[PDB]
Target: Transcription-associated protein 1
Amino acid sequence: YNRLPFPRKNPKLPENTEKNLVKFSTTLLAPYIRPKFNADFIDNKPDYETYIKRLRYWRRRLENKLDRA
Amino acid sequence: HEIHNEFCKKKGFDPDDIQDFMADKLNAAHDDALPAPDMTILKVEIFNSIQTMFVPSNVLKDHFTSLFTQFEDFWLFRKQFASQYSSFVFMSYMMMINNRTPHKIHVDKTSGNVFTLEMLPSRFPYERVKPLLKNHDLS
Model:
């Protein structure tokens, strides 16, 4: 996002990042991670703003989960 | 990076707000009726706005004074941190290793010893980028 993709009016994801994350979704854990991880790139959540917001939300929730271990 | 995150979360921030602030203030000047086509002056003024609004330049020193229960310990820690950071800067300077972000620099809070991980040198494919010449000083 800081590589100056555009002058950033309302950007969109490249196709290689989306194909990399749909590869990583099949290389994820099968039963319970995938139906929630897939619900965050099918519904046009990648637009370089809600994608990063989703990743920050998931990172914070995962760090609280791993800190309550 | 851990010390920076503790300082940011001790106040009402989180350090991705710095990226949001620089992105918003860098994107608010690309618009029409150009107030700053020069990126350097705008980058310097948002650097000063980050250093004043968000993270002052006394965070690391205040964290390490609050860390030790005596000033003898902080003074000896700083005396060893300066020498170990000098050795780290030499190991980063010689062999041309890459960007030393603050999550790649580790510090021992009982000695002052500084080390780093990801000690990968930077090899550029060009022979074209050089202040020195191409032909005479090296063949």
The two ends of chain B are 43 Å apart (CA to CA). Residues 71-93 of chain B form the longest helix (23 residues). The beta strands of chain B are 105-107, 114-116.
